[PDB]
Amino acid sequence: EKEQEEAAAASEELPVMPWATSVASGYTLLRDPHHNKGLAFTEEERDGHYLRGLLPPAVLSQELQIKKFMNTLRQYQTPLQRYIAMMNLQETDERLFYKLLIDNVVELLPFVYTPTVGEACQKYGSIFRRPQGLYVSLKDKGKVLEVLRNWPHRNIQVICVTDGERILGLGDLGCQGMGIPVGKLALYTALGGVDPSVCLPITIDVGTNNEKLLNDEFYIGLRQKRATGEEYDELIEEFMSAVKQFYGEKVLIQFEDFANHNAFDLLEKYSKSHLVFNDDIQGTASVVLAGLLAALKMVGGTLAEQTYLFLGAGEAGTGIAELIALEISKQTNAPIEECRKKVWLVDSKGLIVDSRKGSLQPFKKPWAHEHEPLKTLYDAVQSIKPTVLIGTSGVGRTFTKEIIEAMSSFNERPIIFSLSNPTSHSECTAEQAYTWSQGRSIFASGSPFAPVEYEGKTFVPGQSNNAYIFPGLGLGLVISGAVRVHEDMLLAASKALADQATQDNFEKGSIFPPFTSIRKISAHIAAAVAAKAYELGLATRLPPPSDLVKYAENCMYTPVYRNYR
Amino acid sequence: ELPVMPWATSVASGYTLLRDPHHNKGLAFTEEERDGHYLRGLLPPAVLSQELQIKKFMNTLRQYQTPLQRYIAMMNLQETDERLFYKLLIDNVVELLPFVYTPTVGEACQKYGSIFRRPQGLYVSLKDKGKVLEVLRNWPHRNIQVICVTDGERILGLGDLGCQGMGIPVGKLALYTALGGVDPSVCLPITIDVGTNNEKLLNDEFYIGLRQKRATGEEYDELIEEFMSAVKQFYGEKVLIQFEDFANHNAFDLLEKYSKSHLVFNDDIQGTASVVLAGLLAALKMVGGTLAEQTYLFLGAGEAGTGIAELIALEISKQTNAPIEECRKKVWLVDSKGLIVDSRKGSLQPFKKPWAHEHEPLKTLYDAVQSIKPTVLIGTSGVGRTFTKEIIEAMSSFNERPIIFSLSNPTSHSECTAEQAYTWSQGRSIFASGSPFAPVEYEGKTFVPGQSNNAYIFPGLGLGLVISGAVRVHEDMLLAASKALADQATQDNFEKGSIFPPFTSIRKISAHIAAAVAAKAYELGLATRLPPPSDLVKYAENCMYTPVYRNYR
Amino acid sequence: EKEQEEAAAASEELPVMPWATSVASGYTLLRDPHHNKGLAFTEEERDGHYLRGLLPPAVLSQELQIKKFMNTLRQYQTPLQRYIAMMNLQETDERLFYKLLIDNVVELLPFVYTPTVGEACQKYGSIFRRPQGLYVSLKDKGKVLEVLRNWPHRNIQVICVTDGERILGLGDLGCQGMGIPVGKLALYTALGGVDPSVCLPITIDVGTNNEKLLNDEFYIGLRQKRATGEEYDELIEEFMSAVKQFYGEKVLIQFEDFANHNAFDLLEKYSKSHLVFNDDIQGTASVVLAGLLAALKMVGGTLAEQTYLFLGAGEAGTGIAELIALEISKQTNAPIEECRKKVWLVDSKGLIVDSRKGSLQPFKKPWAHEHEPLKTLYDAVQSIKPTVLIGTSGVGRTFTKEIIEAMSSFNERPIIFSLSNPTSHSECTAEQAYTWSQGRSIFASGSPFAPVEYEGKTFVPGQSNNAYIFPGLGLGLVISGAVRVHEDMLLAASKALADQATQDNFEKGSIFPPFTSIRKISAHIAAAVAAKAYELGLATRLPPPSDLVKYAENCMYTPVYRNYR
């Protein structure tokens, strides 16, 4: 049952690569990112491994290395140039890359992650390219396993995969979506402590509809429009087959930036066979719920009493909403469609209403309450009189002065969540939200914003981005050996994050603690998601450790240089 | 009894192939090559040409704000895809040369320690003495033909950059490939670290060298003669050893002591002398006359100073049949103390006495320019803006077309700019300089000043010594080269005011210099590739590295 | 001219393999024959290269290694078992293999070379196979260069190639012919001093007519009868093209054991374009002529005055004959057909006579003198009354008591040369020749025979095998950079060998000095073949060295262990 090795003795016609292992020295060692210490190679290590001469005489510490890279990183003018310098270092000295990124996480995160990582994806083809991650194309059908075999690590625990269809709020970037999986997985290591070597960034190229990229001569993908239905599905179910055969069932498959229709069928179909998780639906839902709980500690109240208005009824829209209604059902013991009575979503066509359900998309019907057709978010804000406004539209500056002022007029402390990324697609800025609400809004957003000054006070807006959740939640599914993801684990995580939000960060108007604590946060989220995994009896690392927090911290990758023969 | 390294050879595929600069083609790997070498998946589906690769790198190179940032991006590419790096450098040589070579390469050396470093070249320290050969053994190419070596004492006109001198040898050797067609694999950039006197670098916490002041006499000498021993045992005698940026004192003893035992060449003394003489011959086609008739004034009596002068006097001796001591009558050098005159021989340096003619002490270059009344003003001072308006105006007043050569590098140490020389001479000067200057406009006419930099000479001269198997460097080969370059200078480049053809032709130039230096090697009977080929130019062109992508499936 | 690098800068769409170079240590080093020293790895070398533990504590010398292998070689009791143990060592420790073979050359030569190497070829498919040499099949056509590219040494100086059609006197062993090229090239190193790494054993598989091997389930070749004419030719000319492109023109191509018709067209059409040499035609001719000159020092006389009878008018038959007639023409200044008048060959159909030439094979017509048709060698021996009887028949025991007695009756010291191999196909034994001639014959043979006793005296029959010639002749063509073979170099060699034959070896009845001198012999043959190359102006290593013998000895591979760091 929990060691069903009947499926693992189909290892006869499994394609395999005959790997050889050899001691690394000279240029082989220096060109190996996993080991390469650059000038930090001690005198003794250089004599030992035929480096003497290939390096200058000077031996640097890792700390001096960080100071030196930081100095040259700050002299690049555009953010994209600092992204290029960061990806280059990741792929030359992996230990210096991670030790630097952790020690400088607040300064560097906007460059490796949102918002820079968005530009990187738009211009991926034209950017100086050391290869990272694995690309499975439509032309790898029949031979997806052959492609997996090429990856030179067998022990994969975390996969992060996109088909590039909805990269942040920028839409279809086809095969250039790879920036995201590579980003997420770097964070899995820096924020969560997952070892880099067990992380596998994948992109599924099925084409792109982006006309700019079809006609751009530097596009790295198939010059064809996306395959649909039949043709798409077979690649996916062969991919899902192949992952299973190669890596087993305990391998986490984190879906990133798929379209609505797809992102749901993948969570539906593969929930039973695989350990599947969707950062857009489940991960965002998780961090938002934690933000709400953290908000209601500053202002007071429960989730039950609040009224919720969403711009954008996609993945994150319905996904966040469903996790809120569920948390209410656990707190209230009500039937679920009494918990969503006070949750309203507005899409492209306006407020989701029952009168409109005679031609609605299926995953929206549960939010089609009874109300007059409303055309704009402004009309809904004024009619519904919500306590909480969450934006998942992918459209910038849709939280207008009229809308934040309207929200500041009936709420005394309105909860405004501007979730879309990158910064240019933020529904509002931190400056707009604090100004148009006379310093009275509880504000958080997807992309980072500098502190805002208003009537002699400083507001540090919190970052409501799933990067606070998935590093801890992933580590948890792994260190417990969870075989399935349960809605109850998303809640366990949300709890854990919210319970790290103290007065230190509330003082400054931030629903979350600073990223300078993300190692502590990830351990507590991991311990909780593991505890829930055991309770639900979906864990396979039996017996559970006594102290799930201290265990989670002991499983965590550290990028300090260890010494070689 | 020989220390020896057990090298093992293996077929490269997957990440081993991609991480190997020598072979890595990035997206230019064809579909067939990817299936063949376990790349399928590790690269995105799209296959680029090398040409699209060039266009792409060029586009992102121009978005960097500083020259130093484009130098870092160039050195990164050299060390990830060597064939793309060289095919790019060739196709874009005029645009890119100032970034990989003078003047950028100077800043790169000043800030070498603080710059993002993929390792290139070999460092032999004072702590490798006794074991220098052991260090050589670590280089993973056995067939070395061209070595380029500095001890960092005088990097361009920037002085002592100690161990951070490595930027220069790495630069020269890239040019040996790009300009000359030498294969990269046979080129070995070396730096000898013996310390540095630069107090800023001793106290800088990113300095990559020994934190000590330079070893002198005894201790220095031992390392060098052990280096020179070790190179010869490992690579043989036909290996070219190009010395770069040593001090006067040393750069001479190295050419003196190792002329017999080794094939030694000094870019500062011999290489610069060579390109200057070629510039003079090219100048005298625009303006008219012979070397004999001209009068020469130098600022700076160092390596390049006396070196250029001696090669000029020699070319005069071969054209007039006069004794050498008679061909120096027309050639005057001005140092720190003023005009070199015989009157002060009661405490003179020895290698200056041959230029100590008959005259009573003059104090400043301005005094000398006015008294000596020269035809040709050459600056090898290492000091910027020492060719003043008064000096260029003085020179423009008595000559109708005065020859001004501003040789010092980088641009910041140029004795004058191209703009100053053409303005202060009313458009009448024949100007060339060490570091590149953009075209200069003067009443609706465009002046393209030539680049009198040894990069026009050493790529051809090196290729020549190699393809002929020359075992020694002969003063007559410097002349053979000078002639060959000068005889490439047509009216197309003279029209625009340039003594040299554009770098867009450096492949033609290097082949003709190689054929000449080889021909002279055979004639003097120092060549060992016998018999000489019938057509030494077509042979030289066929021996030339091409960086077009080599085919794997 | 000479340096035509025009064809070397037309290597742009040449297939190439991307080789990577890396420092060898641990199991990579031990499994590498070129470097592997086994227990002879010094303490310092083991610490240095991560061997400590993988070897027992004991450090052996190379000498102790030799004593140890020799001891275990003598417990194998078939010769074939000692051939297998020898090939295994060649392919695990190359330096121990060569240092052993040289120091023990007389004892070991019959096991790695004739006659053992013959059995090895007959049973090649069924023998335990460590892989050796390169096989180019009919199904590698279009892609022969691709096959060459796979060999992991670029700098090839000596190729040795067979199509397996006439392996020794055993006939067609198809693809199992490889034993020969591998044998020859080991000797090129042990006897001649050529570095192993510049030597490339090749077999061209075009099928086989051996019905035994077509139906044998362990045959390693194509299960088809030999391709003829058009199909054969294209593979060869593509092979000869491909060798040229990859290795250049200075590469020696030694043909081994082809049939007459082929062996000749290959020397004819590729004499201009390539440096081609045929061990059967030219190499055997060379050592035989040296034997004759050595014989005429024991007994007295000139080549001119002798009368020659050959059994077997093939490659070696006509080839030996033509080299004899040529040496006569250079000594007498006579027209060539006056030099052939006293040379008679007997084939399958009997004595070659002009009355039979109305349907003769082409390369036999020059030996078709005027005489009455004779059916058997015995009839010819008795009619022609020859002074020299040479057997190249491939048929054992055809030099009968009647024939040796007949020869002993009209000559006082008859020269009998039993050239065929292996021992089982020898035209007579050393025992038979000395007994049936009352101790009066000058005898030599292709395969080794122990000393023979007769009337209280010891006869040490010499070995007239091309292994005395091709090691020196090859080294010569290489160290001079010869671009052509000229008949005059075969003679230069023959002279050089003959002039090494002293009274020390003549005392015991041997035309050649023992193989314990083959280092000295090869250097003197090399210096002579080089001198002739320069004289004929076909050498490209100009100027010639002062002392061609001491230069040849300094170019010679030594298998003493190198010390590693």
PDB file of C-alpha atoms in Angstrom, chain C residues 352-523:
ATOM      1  CA  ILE C 352      54.362 -22.023 -64.729  1.00  0.00           C
ATOM      2  CA  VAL C 353      55.487 -22.378 -68.391  1.00  0.00           C
ATOM      3  CA  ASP C 354      54.814 -20.170 -71.491  1.00  0.00           C
ATOM      4  CA  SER C 355      53.054 -23.131 -73.307  1.00  0.00           C
ATOM      5  CA  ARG C 356      50.272 -22.606 -70.651  1.00  0.00           C
ATOM      6  CA  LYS C 357      49.995 -18.750 -71.039  1.00  0.00           C
ATOM      7  CA  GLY C 358      47.023 -18.979 -73.550  1.00  0.00           C
ATOM      8  CA  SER C 359      44.903 -18.822 -70.296  1.00  0.00           C
ATOM      9  CA  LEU C 360      47.213 -17.685 -67.402  1.00  0.00           C
ATOM     10  CA  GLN C 361      46.593 -15.218 -64.490  1.00  0.00           C
ATOM     11  CA  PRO C 362      48.186 -11.791 -65.340  1.00  0.00           C
ATOM     12  CA  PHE C 363      50.886 -11.382 -62.581  1.00  0.00           C
ATOM     13  CA  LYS C 364      52.307 -14.893 -63.426  1.00  0.00           C
ATOM     14  CA  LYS C 365      53.118 -14.235 -67.178  1.00  0.00           C
ATOM     15  CA  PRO C 366      56.567 -12.706 -66.324  1.00  0.00           C
ATOM     16  CA  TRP C 367      57.603 -16.083 -64.797  1.00  0.00           C
ATOM     17  CA  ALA C 368      56.208 -18.221 -67.720  1.00  0.00           C
ATOM     18  CA  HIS C 369      59.638 -19.259 -69.154  1.00  0.00           C
ATOM     19  CA  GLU C 370      59.934 -21.958 -71.943  1.00  0.00           C
ATOM     20  CA  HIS C 371      59.918 -25.566 -70.519  1.00  0.00           C
ATOM     21  CA  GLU C 372      57.753 -28.728 -70.845  1.00  0.00           C
ATOM     22  CA  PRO C 373      54.606 -28.736 -68.613  1.00  0.00           C
ATOM     23  CA  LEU C 374      55.372 -30.411 -65.197  1.00  0.00           C
ATOM     24  CA  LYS C 375      52.480 -31.429 -62.842  1.00  0.00           C
ATOM     25  CA  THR C 376      54.107 -31.592 -59.350  1.00  0.00           C
ATOM     26  CA  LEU C 377      56.762 -29.657 -57.355  1.00  0.00           C
ATOM     27  CA  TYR C 378      58.724 -32.972 -57.239  1.00  0.00           C
ATOM     28  CA  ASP C 379      58.909 -33.013 -61.110  1.00  0.00           C
ATOM     29  CA  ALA C 380      60.035 -29.365 -61.233  1.00  0.00           C
ATOM     30  CA  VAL C 381      62.601 -29.915 -58.359  1.00  0.00           C
ATOM     31  CA  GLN C 382      64.168 -32.780 -60.336  1.00  0.00           C
ATOM     32  CA  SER C 383      64.101 -31.085 -63.820  1.00  0.00           C
ATOM     33  CA  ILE C 384      65.057 -27.437 -62.849  1.00  0.00           C
ATOM     34  CA  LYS C 385      67.670 -28.622 -60.275  1.00  0.00           C
ATOM     35  CA  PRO C 386      67.263 -25.431 -58.191  1.00  0.00           C
ATOM     36  CA  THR C 387      69.768 -24.075 -55.575  1.00  0.00           C
ATOM     37  CA  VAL C 388      66.948 -22.344 -53.581  1.00  0.00           C
ATOM     38  CA  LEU C 389      63.521 -23.883 -52.745  1.00  0.00           C
ATOM     39  CA  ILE C 390      60.996 -21.364 -51.263  1.00  0.00           C
ATOM     40  CA  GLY C 391      57.510 -22.468 -50.109  1.00  0.00           C
ATOM     41  CA  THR C 392      54.604 -19.968 -50.004  1.00  0.00           C
ATOM     42  CA  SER C 393      51.844 -22.602 -50.692  1.00  0.00           C
ATOM     43  CA  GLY C 394      49.804 -22.286 -47.463  1.00  0.00           C
ATOM     44  CA  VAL C 395      49.890 -26.167 -47.476  1.00  0.00           C
ATOM     45  CA  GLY C 396      51.745 -28.156 -44.804  1.00  0.00           C
ATOM     46  CA  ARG C 397      54.230 -30.996 -45.389  1.00  0.00           C
ATOM     47  CA  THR C 398      54.470 -30.383 -49.251  1.00  0.00           C
ATOM     48  CA  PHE C 399      58.318 -30.277 -48.844  1.00  0.00           C
ATOM     49  CA  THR C 400      58.453 -34.120 -48.723  1.00  0.00           C
ATOM     50  CA  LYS C 401      61.422 -36.475 -47.891  1.00  0.00           C
ATOM     51  CA  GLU C 402      61.709 -37.099 -51.737  1.00  0.00           C
ATOM     52  CA  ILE C 403      61.922 -33.313 -52.401  1.00  0.00           C
ATOM     53  CA  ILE C 404      64.431 -32.404 -49.588  1.00  0.00           C
ATOM     54  CA  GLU C 405      66.469 -35.563 -50.482  1.00  0.00           C
ATOM     55  CA  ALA C 406      66.396 -34.587 -54.227  1.00  0.00           C
ATOM     56  CA  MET C 407      67.531 -31.011 -53.221  1.00  0.00           C
ATOM     57  CA  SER C 408      70.322 -32.456 -50.935  1.00  0.00           C
ATOM     58  CA  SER C 409      71.508 -34.704 -53.855  1.00  0.00           C
ATOM     59  CA  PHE C 410      72.455 -31.995 -56.500  1.00  0.00           C
ATOM     60  CA  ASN C 411      73.221 -29.066 -54.093  1.00  0.00           C
ATOM     61  CA  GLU C 412      75.895 -29.579 -51.390  1.00  0.00           C
ATOM     62  CA  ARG C 413      74.114 -26.977 -49.111  1.00  0.00           C
ATOM     63  CA  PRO C 414      70.498 -26.525 -50.417  1.00  0.00           C
ATOM     64  CA  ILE C 415      68.659 -23.320 -49.305  1.00  0.00           C
ATOM     65  CA  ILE C 416      65.160 -24.447 -48.118  1.00  0.00           C
ATOM     66  CA  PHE C 417      62.719 -21.700 -47.008  1.00  0.00           C
ATOM     67  CA  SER C 418      59.410 -23.016 -45.538  1.00  0.00           C
ATOM     68  CA  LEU C 419      57.539 -19.699 -45.249  1.00  0.00           C
ATOM     69  CA  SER C 420      53.838 -20.707 -44.796  1.00  0.00           C
ATOM     70  CA  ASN C 421      52.158 -20.178 -41.362  1.00  0.00           C
ATOM     71  CA  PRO C 422      51.117 -21.249 -38.923  1.00  0.00           C
ATOM     72  CA  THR C 423      53.319 -24.307 -37.897  1.00  0.00           C
ATOM     73  CA  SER C 424      50.571 -26.798 -39.049  1.00  0.00           C
ATOM     74  CA  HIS C 425      50.800 -25.300 -42.620  1.00  0.00           C
ATOM     75  CA  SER C 426      54.710 -25.171 -42.683  1.00  0.00           C
ATOM     76  CA  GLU C 427      55.858 -26.882 -45.981  1.00  0.00           C
ATOM     77  CA  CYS C 428      58.237 -28.896 -43.713  1.00  0.00           C
ATOM     78  CA  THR C 429      59.450 -28.901 -40.048  1.00  0.00           C
ATOM     79  CA  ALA C 430      63.033 -27.951 -39.004  1.00  0.00           C
ATOM     80  CA  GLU C 431      63.422 -31.643 -37.861  1.00  0.00           C
ATOM     81  CA  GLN C 432      62.491 -32.988 -41.400  1.00  0.00           C
ATOM     82  CA  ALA C 433      64.739 -30.486 -43.355  1.00  0.00           C
ATOM     83  CA  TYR C 434      67.944 -31.218 -41.313  1.00  0.00           C
ATOM     84  CA  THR C 435      67.263 -35.055 -41.229  1.00  0.00           C
ATOM     85  CA  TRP C 436      66.255 -35.508 -44.956  1.00  0.00           C
ATOM     86  CA  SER C 437      69.288 -33.352 -46.053  1.00  0.00           C
ATOM     87  CA  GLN C 438      71.879 -35.115 -43.762  1.00  0.00           C
ATOM     88  CA  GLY C 439      72.478 -31.809 -41.829  1.00  0.00           C
ATOM     89  CA  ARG C 440      73.531 -29.955 -45.033  1.00  0.00           C
ATOM     90  CA  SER C 441      70.464 -27.640 -45.658  1.00  0.00           C
ATOM     91  CA  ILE C 442      70.357 -23.898 -44.863  1.00  0.00           C
ATOM     92  CA  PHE C 443      66.797 -23.869 -43.423  1.00  0.00           C
ATOM     93  CA  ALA C 444      64.482 -21.058 -42.329  1.00  0.00           C
ATOM     94  CA  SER C 445      60.643 -20.919 -41.872  1.00  0.00           C
ATOM     95  CA  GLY C 446      57.722 -18.525 -41.150  1.00  0.00           C
ATOM     96  CA  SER C 447      56.722 -20.031 -37.754  1.00  0.00           C
ATOM     97  CA  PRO C 448      59.222 -20.706 -34.881  1.00  0.00           C
ATOM     98  CA  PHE C 449      60.852 -24.229 -34.443  1.00  0.00           C
ATOM     99  CA  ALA C 450      62.996 -25.308 -31.456  1.00  0.00           C
ATOM    100  CA  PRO C 451      66.681 -26.198 -32.016  1.00  0.00           C
ATOM    101  CA  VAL C 452      67.100 -29.590 -33.913  1.00  0.00           C
ATOM    102  CA  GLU C 453      69.870 -32.223 -33.073  1.00  0.00           C
ATOM    103  CA  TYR C 454      71.545 -34.361 -35.871  1.00  0.00           C
ATOM    104  CA  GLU C 455      74.949 -36.240 -35.866  1.00  0.00           C
ATOM    105  CA  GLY C 456      75.796 -34.787 -32.389  1.00  0.00           C
ATOM    106  CA  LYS C 457      75.341 -31.127 -33.474  1.00  0.00           C
ATOM    107  CA  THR C 458      72.644 -28.387 -32.771  1.00  0.00           C
ATOM    108  CA  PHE C 459      70.831 -26.545 -35.679  1.00  0.00           C
ATOM    109  CA  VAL C 460      68.986 -23.281 -34.677  1.00  0.00           C
ATOM    110  CA  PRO C 461      66.764 -22.705 -37.762  1.00  0.00           C
ATOM    111  CA  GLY C 462      66.261 -18.954 -38.423  1.00  0.00           C
ATOM    112  CA  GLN C 463      62.751 -17.370 -38.545  1.00  0.00           C
ATOM    113  CA  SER C 464      62.218 -15.863 -42.037  1.00  0.00           C
ATOM    114  CA  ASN C 465      59.086 -13.872 -40.952  1.00  0.00           C
ATOM    115  CA  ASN C 466      58.335 -10.241 -42.033  1.00  0.00           C
ATOM    116  CA  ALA C 467      58.306  -9.296 -38.253  1.00  0.00           C
ATOM    117  CA  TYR C 468      62.133  -8.754 -38.618  1.00  0.00           C
ATOM    118  CA  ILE C 469      61.484  -6.098 -41.414  1.00  0.00           C
ATOM    119  CA  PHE C 470      58.145  -4.139 -40.964  1.00  0.00           C
ATOM    120  CA  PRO C 471      58.887  -2.808 -37.394  1.00  0.00           C
ATOM    121  CA  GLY C 472      62.158  -1.188 -38.653  1.00  0.00           C
ATOM    122  CA  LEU C 473      60.693  -0.285 -42.139  1.00  0.00           C
ATOM    123  CA  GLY C 474      57.598   1.344 -40.544  1.00  0.00           C
ATOM    124  CA  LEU C 475      59.643   3.337 -37.910  1.00  0.00           C
ATOM    125  CA  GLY C 476      61.819   4.465 -40.856  1.00  0.00           C
ATOM    126  CA  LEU C 477      58.924   5.737 -43.050  1.00  0.00           C
ATOM    127  CA  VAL C 478      57.619   7.597 -39.912  1.00  0.00           C
ATOM    128  CA  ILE C 479      60.859   9.187 -38.441  1.00  0.00           C
ATOM    129  CA  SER C 480      61.778  10.470 -42.003  1.00  0.00           C
ATOM    130  CA  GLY C 481      58.222  11.552 -42.891  1.00  0.00           C
ATOM    131  CA  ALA C 482      58.347   9.461 -46.094  1.00  0.00           C
ATOM    132  CA  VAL C 483      55.254  10.038 -48.344  1.00  0.00           C
ATOM    133  CA  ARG C 484      55.890   7.025 -50.634  1.00  0.00           C
ATOM    134  CA  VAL C 485      57.176   3.420 -50.628  1.00  0.00           C
ATOM    135  CA  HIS C 486      59.927   2.805 -53.274  1.00  0.00           C
ATOM    136  CA  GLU C 487      61.108  -0.752 -54.116  1.00  0.00           C
ATOM    137  CA  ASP C 488      64.629   0.671 -53.295  1.00  0.00           C
ATOM    138  CA  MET C 489      63.583   0.916 -49.530  1.00  0.00           C
ATOM    139  CA  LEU C 490      62.654  -2.821 -49.401  1.00  0.00           C
ATOM    140  CA  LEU C 491      66.260  -3.483 -50.675  1.00  0.00           C
ATOM    141  CA  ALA C 492      67.772  -0.944 -48.174  1.00  0.00           C
ATOM    142  CA  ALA C 493      65.960  -2.890 -45.397  1.00  0.00           C
ATOM    143  CA  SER C 494      66.989  -6.333 -46.739  1.00  0.00           C
ATOM    144  CA  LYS C 495      70.657  -5.139 -46.779  1.00  0.00           C
ATOM    145  CA  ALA C 496      70.356  -3.669 -43.217  1.00  0.00           C
ATOM    146  CA  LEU C 497      68.976  -6.943 -41.731  1.00  0.00           C
ATOM    147  CA  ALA C 498      71.456  -9.164 -43.620  1.00  0.00           C
ATOM    148  CA  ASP C 499      74.342  -6.901 -42.367  1.00  0.00           C
ATOM    149  CA  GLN C 500      73.246  -7.614 -38.736  1.00  0.00           C
ATOM    150  CA  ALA C 501      73.748 -11.417 -39.391  1.00  0.00           C
ATOM    151  CA  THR C 502      77.181 -12.257 -37.839  1.00  0.00           C
ATOM    152  CA  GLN C 503      79.063 -15.567 -37.239  1.00  0.00           C
ATOM    153  CA  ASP C 504      77.579 -15.752 -33.674  1.00  0.00           C
ATOM    154  CA  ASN C 505      74.205 -16.733 -35.265  1.00  0.00           C
ATOM    155  CA  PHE C 506      75.762 -18.399 -38.408  1.00  0.00           C
ATOM    156  CA  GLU C 507      77.799 -20.758 -36.055  1.00  0.00           C
ATOM    157  CA  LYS C 508      74.410 -22.266 -34.883  1.00  0.00           C
ATOM    158  CA  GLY C 509      73.077 -22.456 -38.535  1.00  0.00           C
ATOM    159  CA  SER C 510      70.764 -19.330 -38.217  1.00  0.00           C
ATOM    160  CA  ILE C 511      70.566 -16.752 -41.075  1.00  0.00           C
ATOM    161  CA  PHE C 512      69.275 -14.052 -38.603  1.00  0.00           C
ATOM    162  CA  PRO C 513      70.359 -12.908 -35.129  1.00  0.00           C
ATOM    163  CA  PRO C 514      68.058 -13.823 -32.216  1.00  0.00           C
ATOM    164  CA  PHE C 515      64.941 -11.604 -31.448  1.00  0.00           C
ATOM    165  CA  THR C 516      66.758 -10.539 -28.206  1.00  0.00           C
ATOM    166  CA  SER C 517      68.523  -7.975 -30.603  1.00  0.00           C
ATOM    167  CA  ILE C 518      65.368  -6.751 -32.509  1.00  0.00           C
ATOM    168  CA  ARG C 519      65.737  -3.261 -30.895  1.00  0.00           C
ATOM    169  CA  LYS C 520      69.226  -2.875 -32.491  1.00  0.00           C
ATOM    170  CA  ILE C 521      67.966  -4.493 -35.818  1.00  0.00           C
ATOM    171  CA  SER C 522      64.897  -2.172 -36.142  1.00  0.00           C
ATOM    172  CA  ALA C 523      67.050   1.015 -35.559  1.00  0.00           C
TER     173      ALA C 523
END
